[model samples]
Target chain A: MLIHIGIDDTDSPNGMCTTYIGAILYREISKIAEPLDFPRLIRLNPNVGNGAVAMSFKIDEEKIKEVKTLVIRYVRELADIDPGIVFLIGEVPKELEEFSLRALREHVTIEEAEHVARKVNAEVYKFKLGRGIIGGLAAIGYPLEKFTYELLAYRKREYWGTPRRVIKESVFYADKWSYPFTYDNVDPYKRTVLITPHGKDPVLVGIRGIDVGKILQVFEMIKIEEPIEFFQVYKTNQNT
Target chain B: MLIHIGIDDMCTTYIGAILYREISKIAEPLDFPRLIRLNNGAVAMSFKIDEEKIKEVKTLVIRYVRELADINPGIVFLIGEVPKELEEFSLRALREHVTIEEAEHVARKVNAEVYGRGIIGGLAAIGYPLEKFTYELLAYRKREYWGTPRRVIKESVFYADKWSYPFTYDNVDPYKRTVLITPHGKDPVLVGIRGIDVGKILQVFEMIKIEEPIEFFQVYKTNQNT
Candidate 1:
């Protein structure tokens, strides 16, 4: 049996990253359970800031308790926003597929999400306002028929607002080596690293692309002036 | 003789209370104020932790920062009485965008550990000797009701302001005929009551009617006149 775990709103515009927690979960749970797939990075309602991640893994009764505890610990220790979590057993329903598309194209309500979860037999947890439940379920239910990949690098706590120094030529070469396979590495027209963001979020860079194995190839091809605290490879629907 | 942890726009109202209340158990946590820092609003938690429990306090602060995600976080501990020069520097910090260079130089004179860009405001909040200080009472919402809409009685704020006047200020801007005690944002502060007399500020707080539960309230001595 597979457990699809959804998490959302663990960060804000000023700082923090929900995907950072996703990276940790992916690594930690791999040891205790069978990973169904790469961590899912789902995007929705771009006007509203949401960084949600969903994961699926098969675990026994003994390991299930630990995984559940880890999720709570990481969320409580990392999140400040109105975070929400969703856990559904086995496969996702077509109803959620419809709900998730709506989540991406339009605004959603927590009550509708609750009604859908009850119908689908999904367990939902609302830490604060629990508004994130809408996005959490959306991430899990997102039908990734056309999907892409993203490798995100994290920064140390003290260096969040500081400059992210990178050798542009390295990114250029990496982009060239993984061209078509990986993208948003660097903008040749603007002569800027599109992978790096100017926000104070813990994310140093997010490299997106088409192929799983090929996208990971660029991870070591680029050189950075600052140390990367950690990195995670996410299978996403970003470019789609 | 205080470890003034200064933070910028990090929920200086309600979140300040969280750290302040936690540190208060083992140390003497005193007044927290939202000081002027050019553009960014600021708050400082002035507390004295024992040398033995120092690591625990810093760890506690770090844990919460990681959880709350305050990017511009700075921590420093100043020993003994705050110097006369540092007091003047804080006034400048309140007036201008005081540089980290000056904060480092001035803090060197007193000798303290500092980190992050917020060091300037953090050190400033500590050095502000509060010559023209007033008392502010912040009533925080409970954990369950933090992000929900605040339901404070608007009319009660005007009455609270009227009773404490010529002493209590910023409660109601009568010219605008608007209630100023309540904030419109999602932060945990239910209402803020400011006054010259600590007792009166607390007394006036009782006059304001509320529809929600208040977790806790703290009376902070501050330099804010407006």
Candidate 2:
């Protein structure tokens, strides 16, 4: 059977990154069920955060329960805020897809998200206020037929929340080499590099592209001072 | 000495723009009021005016809405400062239906007075400020197009981005395969654009030439439950 698992809010404001959580999940889940495709990383509205991971697996009941326990245990230890996880079995409903689109483009209330989840019979688990459920459920309903990809590279835990030093020339070269295949890389007109985050988070840089192969190629092009231990390629909703 | 006026629950087949046009003629240099859609299927219209003309404005608004009361019963209006509590009350009414008794109770505490069955929606619209608002440009359908398929209007709505100004929301409901350009009632509103600036809305309307004759068009802000 095919199952789509969505996880969000697994990081603290000043602590871990959701991308790191996705990498850990990928490692754990790969041990059991085989992943059909790369996990998805969805971006939401401005006020709400980003870095969502959606993955599907072909597995049995025992493997499914094991993945669930892994997620809850990790998120409970990592997130200071409420974390939400949604398990969508079989085909996702059109209403849920619309709800996810709304959540992506507009501000959605926890109650509204829960209401839609209940209507579709999708299982949603929350830790606290469950604000993350909005993003968690939204990640599953993301229509994968039309999608994009982002390669997120992470720094060591000791390097979390510290300023990241990346070679500007490497990023520019990647932008030049990849051209339109890569997006939001460097603003040539403004002479500015836009991929690196200013926050003291674990994410070293997220390179978004239409082609996954091109993204991986470009990721190797950029060089970082810190040790790059983990990286995950995510299919995301950056097209809009 | 500025007073904000809110009017709601005018049950009529006519569009809310008609009431707006009438209010425009009576109030000199009348600034357009914010338009809010209530959960109870009511259109609430609110605006600000010089305090001295409050009595005159009240009298004219009552006379105009009352004329439609025979057909549009439960029509009401409220005028005053929208305190924090009043704004909260209005926000709640948009998401969920609030009773007239509860609306009246809140209005009394804020020194805002209510009229007719509009107590619920009127108070809600009164609290929302017009400065931070979005506009909806409504175009009326011609006589021949009445009770016809909305396909023609859908064409204009699909060209929404062509006008240059960004729209706050899509007028076309993707799920329904229909354009929300005109109202479902007997009122005449062909197409409307909701955006941040009223000037941008007007500019867009001028750029997009519609085939049908529009009876009326208006820009109003409303609390939409997203």
Scored by TM against the true chain B, the candidates give 0.76, 0.66
Worst 10 residues of 1 chain B by lDDT: B163-172
Quote each prediction's TM-score: 0.45, 0.45
Tens digit of per-residue lDDT, candidate 1, span A56-104: 8877766666777777777777664344677777666667777877788
lDDT of 1 by residue, B12-94 (tens): 65566667777777788554544544445456666655667767777786677667774456656565455666666776776
Each prediction's interface RMSD?
A: 29.2, 20.9
Deviating ranges (above 4 Å) for candidate 2? A10-16, A46-51, A77-82, A170-194, B1-226
Which candidate has the highest lDDT of all?
1
Each model's lDDT: 0.66, 0.60
TM-score of 1: 0.45
